[PDB]
Amino acid sequence: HMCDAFVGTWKLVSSENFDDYMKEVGVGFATRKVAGMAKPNMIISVNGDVITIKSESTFKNTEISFILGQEFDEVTADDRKVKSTITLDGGVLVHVQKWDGKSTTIKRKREDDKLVVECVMKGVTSTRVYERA
């Protein structure tokens, strides 16, 4: 029952500073522009200890499956090859991605009926708000 309140199908309803976040991460112009138009569907499910997060969009579909606290390979939607670890900290899913000596942290939180995603790369934060589909 660890992630019960995250489970479901979620649709993006607002974005702030995502282009700047993607710039800070190193995403190039064309990918930023196309990816920035997308309104992804995030689908979160749990089977035993395995959490799966899918994101479906016109641009790219991604899927990760993981166990909390256990590092894994992830190829991001912008084609970074990263090492990821996702933990639960006080009810927040905290996802750290490491690549090329860099790091970014993505936090996913339930707040009212929303799922709020905060992405941080050095001093840049972007907020992506999802509601139930």
Ligand X SMILES: O=C(O)c1ccccc1NC(=O)N1CCc2ccccc21
21 belongs to an annotated ligand binding site: no
129 belongs to an annotated ligand binding site: yes
Examine residue 109 and tell whether it contacts ligand X (CB under 6 A): no
Rounded alpha-carbon distances, angstroms, from residue 73 to 80, 96, 129: 10, 12, 26
Count Cβ neighbours within 10 Å for each residue of 46-68 and write b for 16 or more, e otherwise: eeeeebebbbbbebbebebebee
- CA–CA distance, 113 with 14 (Å, rounded to integer): 14
Examine residue 128 and tell whether it contacts ligand X (CB under 6 A): yes
Examine residue 25 and tell whether it contacts ligand X (CB under 6 A): no
Stretch that binds ligand X, among 3-11, 24-32, 58-66, 79-87 (CB under 6 A): 58-66
Kindly state the helix (H) or strand (E) to which residue 6 belongs, with its residue range. Answer: none
130 belongs to an annotated ligand binding site: yes
Examine residue 35 and tell whether it contacts ligand X (CB under 6 A): yes
Binding mask 75-94 for ligand X (x = CB under 6 A): --x-----------------
SS3 72: strand
Examine residue 57 and tell whether it contacts ligand X (CB under 6 A): yes
Examine residue 38 and tell whether it contacts ligand X (CB under 6 A): yes
Residues with Cβ < 8 Å from 115, sequence gap 6 or more? 6, 10, 42, 108, 109, 129, 130, 131
Residues that bind ligand X (CB under 6 A): 35, 38, 40, 55, 57, 59-60, 62, 77, 106, 117, 119, 128
Q: Which residues define the annotated binding site for a fatty acid?
A: 128-130
